[PDB]
Write a protein that binds this ligand. Structure first.
Ligand code: K
Ligand code: K
Ligand code: K
Ligand code: K
Ligand code: K
Ligand code: K
Ligand code: MG
Ligand code: MG
Ligand code: MG
Ligand code: MG
Ligand code: MG
Ligand code: MG
Ligand code: MG
Ligand code: MG
Ligand code: MG
Ligand code: MG
Lengths: 316, 101, 132, 138
RNA sequence: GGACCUGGCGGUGCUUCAUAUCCCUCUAGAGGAGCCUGUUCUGUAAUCGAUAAACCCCGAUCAACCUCACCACCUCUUGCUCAGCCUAUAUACCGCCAUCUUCAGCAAACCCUGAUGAAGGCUACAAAGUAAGCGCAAGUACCCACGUAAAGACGUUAGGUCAAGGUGUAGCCC
């Protein structure tokens, strides 16, 4: 047999730790830095200059990391020279998984005797790293069922720490629009500037705090620039929703796209710039009305063997 | 030592088109105008038609330089689609990659 | 099904290289290019003449270093210069390598009117990426 | 311990003629890899600061040339393969150079230009009105 | 001949499905006319190939001569080539593909069952399966997490192409 799984022992990895430390001092002499305060971010920056690779895959580019982040964690020898396995559940095959179920089931019996947002249960792929054991989907569910059962009971302080280990954290980005900084012009008028995008159209809108409802697109009155009523309706929508028509002066400049792509791009820009002159509650209503979201619908490409993007040539 | 006789014929064609390029240019210039008399233009119509057929550039064919394939040829690399892909599929053509978008 | 530049699966006794183990749809994602010049850049010319030189150089080296090439050539061009970089086996004696370096460098410099330099990197045995 | 006691320096003589003044020097480099152009910019910008040259860097929009070819040798028209060439740019706009300064700098960066990277140097020279243009020949 | 196994099939059963799909249902079309274009017949002294799905503006991102391989007439003979051949065979092949694939299988090496037959191999409150590797998946590209491309194993149809090129075999060489 020619194909053998590359097994890395502790002595081999120990020699790799010495070559990285020596290589870390050489790379600092090349770049002229101080070896002592040479972090791993600088190594990533120096290896990207000395070995410039434009490969889209970032895992296929040159990398000079610590051997503990490259080589995978391997199941260590599971017995001594005599041959007796250290752990008492070695012959199960999943001594780490069953030792955890044995511990969790032992804490649920003591409870009987004496008697949240932002957090998620450890995923399957993350639970095989704590145990270094391959786990099936069904076994993972069984473990989660015992932890939940643990929580319902009147668990002690120590148990809370145990469960917390298996509860990973999720950073949830508050769905709140980012208010633009109100600026002041030479005369002293307050306004807010924002940008929009629709299909291939890009728009910049300036919304003055006080105005007589005058809109100028590219230096032209909006009714002249937009003859079709539908386009004018889109412009009104943001202001009508916040029941403040005829109170601001807008000066926008849209470029690219077509008739209907330019209005949508202006609507979104005005709406974003009109969030600085309205209350927080009104901005959430605008968001729930679809006035602050960028429509991602763009033209789909045509495929070599078809008449269109999705249309197919006639089947004979 | 060319791929085939078809390639060899074009090689001669291209060699004879380079020798008469100037002579044909000077004679056509007379024909391509409304200034000179028809009598002189009619004499130039017989002089450029008496030159060898292989001097005419419309007989030159852009074949592949490796397989002498007349059709399916890329002018920038002078290769057929089959020979171009072979070198492109093996990463031998600088910059050439498969497109996905 | 697609066949180009793909090594079909086998029992497991067939050793393939990194370049030989990746298909054409990885040429710019996991692989680079074996030749690097400007001919194929926007607004550049002489892409058909740099290509013919590459096809011949790869054959000249394959027949001039028989049995000694572990992997494909990496041709590099910088101005007038042409740099051939190769991975070769250690079976052949060094005396014969130096002869082939001065013969190929000189012959190819008078044939393509350019300074040609060849950089060998000997390896004990053909580096194996995986066994298909 | 073995080091040259003395060194010989290349002769650079000062001529009697005037020098050429370049209002702007624009270097446009093309390539297929963006990392080689980001690595070439660092060397070119650092070499200018050490020589005392004003330099500005921007990145023009890339171009992608695509074309399609038949997948099979014979028939099977509906099945094709698409290939592309990606060209990435990087413009280094230097200003207020001289002929001698531009000469050595361009040679230095041009020689170290990496494989697969072209260059287009546009030079804007400052001249003076010719004598004949000063006054009409009445 | 008897009795089994596998696979295929069934105008075979149950149940659950099909989201542009089997049917109904929504929208624009085809077949009707004229033209363009390909093919088949017929015709001509006057190519070839593809040719149910998976051929038919297909090889050709292309034929006034050339391309050209076809026909008729004339001509040459170590001949552009240390010759040559678009001669036959794709049912000898590489190479590049189609197709099922708008799939989810595929499999080395072991183990067990069946009395050591072909064969077969699950039940999570678990009853003999474990599995590197290939694929899917994941990553990547494009305007993201979406979607579209790309990818898509082993096999099937002795599928397609000796006329891309190369090539085994048989054949031609005033
Ligand atoms: K059956
Ligand atoms: K109709
Ligand atoms: K019709
Ligand atoms: K085949
Ligand atoms: K043959
Ligand atoms: K052939
Ligand atoms: Mg359409
Ligand atoms: Mg005319
Ligand atoms: Mg396909
Ligand atoms: Mg036909
Ligand atoms: Mg003819
Ligand atoms: Mg013939
Ligand atoms: Mg076949
Ligand atoms: Mg995706
Ligand atoms: Mg596809
Ligand atoms: Mg995939």
């Amino acid at each position: 047999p020619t194909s053998k799984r590359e097994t890395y022992t502790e002595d081999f990895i120990k020699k790799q730790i010495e070559e990285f430390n020596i290589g870390k001092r050489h790379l600092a002499n090349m770049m002229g830095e101080d070896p002592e305060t040479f972090t791993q971010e600088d190594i990533d920056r120096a290896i990207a200059y000395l070995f410039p690779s434009g490969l889209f895959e970032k895992r296929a580019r040159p990398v000079m990391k610590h051997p503990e982040q490259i080589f995978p964690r391997q199941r260590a020898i599971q017995w001594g020279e005599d041959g007796r396995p250290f752990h008492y559940l070695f012959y199960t095959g999943k001594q780490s998984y069953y030792s955890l179920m044995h511990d969790v089931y032992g804490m649920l019996l003591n409870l009987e005797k004496h008697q949240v947002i932002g957090s998620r249960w450890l995923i399957k792929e993350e639970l095989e790293e704590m145990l270094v054991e391959k786990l099936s989907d069904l076994d993972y569910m069984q473990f989660i069922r015992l932890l939940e059962k643990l929580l319902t009971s009147q668990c002690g302080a120590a148990e809370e720490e145990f469960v917390q280990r298996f509860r990973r954290s999720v950073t949830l980005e508050s769905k709140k629009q980012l208010i633009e900084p109100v600026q002041y012009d030479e005369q002293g008028m307050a306004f807010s500037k924002s940008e929009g995008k629709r299909k291939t159209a890009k728009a910049e809108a300036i919304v003055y705090k006080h105005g007589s409802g005058r809109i100028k697109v590219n230096g032209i009155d909006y009714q002249l620039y937009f003859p079709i009523t539908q386009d004018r309706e889109q412009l009104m929508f943001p202001f009508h929703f916040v029941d403040r028509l005829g109170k601001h002066d807008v000066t926008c400049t849209v470029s690219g796209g077509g008739r209907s792509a330019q209005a949508g791009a202006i609507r979104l820009a005005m709406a974003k710039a009109l969030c600085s002159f309205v209350t927080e509650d009104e901005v959430e209503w605008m968001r729930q009305a679809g006035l602050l979201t960028t429509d991602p619908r763009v033209r789909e490409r045509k495929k070599p063997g078809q008449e269109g993007a999705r249309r197919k040539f006639t089947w004979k | 030592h060319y791929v085939d006789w078809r390639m060899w014929r074009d090689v001669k064609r291209r060699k004879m088109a380079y020798e008469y390029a100037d002579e044909r240019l000077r004679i056509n210039s007379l024909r391509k105008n409304t200034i000179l008399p028809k009598i002189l233009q009619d004499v130039a119509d017989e002089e450029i038609a008496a030159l060898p057929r292989d001097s005419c550039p419309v007989r030159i064919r852009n074949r592949c330089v490796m397989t002498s394939r007349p059709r399916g040829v890329k002018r920038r690399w002078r290769l057929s689609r089959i020979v171009f892909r072979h070198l492109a599929d093996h990463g031998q053509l600088s910059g050439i990659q498969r497109a996905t978008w | 099904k697609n066949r180009a530049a793909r090594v079909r699966v086998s029992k497991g006794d067939k050793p393939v290289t990194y370049e030989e183990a990746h298909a054409p749809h990885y040429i710019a994602h996991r692989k680079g290019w074996l030749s690097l010049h400007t001919g194929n850049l926007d607004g550049e010319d002489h892409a058909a003449e740099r290509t013919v030189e590459d096809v011949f150089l790869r054959k000249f080296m394959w027949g001039t270093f028989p049995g000694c090439l572990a992997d494909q050539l990496v041709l590099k061009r910088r101005g007038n210069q042409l740099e051939i970089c190769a991975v070769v086996l250690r079976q052949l004696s060094p005396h014969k390598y130096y002869f082939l370096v001065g013969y190929s460098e000189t012959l190819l410099s008078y044939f393509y009117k350019c300074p040609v330099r060849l950089h060998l990197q000997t390896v004990p045995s053909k580096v194996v990426y995986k066994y298909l | 311990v073995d080091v040259p006691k003395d060194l010989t320096k290349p002769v650079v003589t000062i001529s009697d003629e005037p020098d050429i003044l370049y209002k702007r020097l624009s270097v446009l480099v093309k390539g297929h890899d963006k990392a080689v152009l980001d690595s070439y910019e660092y060397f070119a910008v650092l070499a200018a600061k050490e020589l005392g040259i004003s330099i500005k860097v921007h990145e023009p929009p890339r171009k992608i040339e695509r074309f399609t070819l038949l997948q099979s040798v014979h028939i099977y028209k509906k099945h094709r393969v698409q290939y592309e060439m990606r060209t990435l740019y990087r413009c280094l706009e230097l200003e207020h150079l001289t002929g001698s300064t531009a000469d050595v700098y361009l040679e230095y960066i041009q020689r170290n230009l990496p494989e697969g990277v072209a260059m287009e140097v546009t030079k804007t020279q400052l001249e003076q009105l010719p004598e004949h243009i000063k006054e009409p020949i009445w």
